[PDB]
């Protein structure tokens, strides 16, 4: 019954969850760029 009311009201039940997993791989990209700095330069220089 929950899916057919969300179908009626045009409510996406996973719009928050699809945007959650799409920013979680987007913040994994900048993390993959951020540790390229610390692997290259080191922890004392970065601090």
């Amino acid at each position: 019954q929950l899916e057919v009311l969300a179908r009626y009201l045009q409510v996406d039940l996973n719009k928050g969850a699809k945007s959650f997993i799409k920013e979680k791989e987007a913040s994994a990209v900048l993390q993959k760029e951020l540790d390229l700095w610390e692997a290259e330069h080191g922890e004392f220089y970065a601090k």
């Binding site: 057919v4 009311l5 179908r7 009626y8």
Partner: peptide, 29 residues
């Protein structure tokens, strides 16, 4: 004179349903 004769005798010469179908679409589901 025909007019009088004819007279004498009396023989003269939207979306509401689009809203409705989506209501039955809910109840059919």
């Amino acid at each position: 004179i025909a007019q009088k004769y004819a007279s004498s005798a009396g023989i003269s010469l939207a979306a509401l349903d689009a809203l409705t179908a989506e209501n039955k679409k809910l109840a059919k589901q």
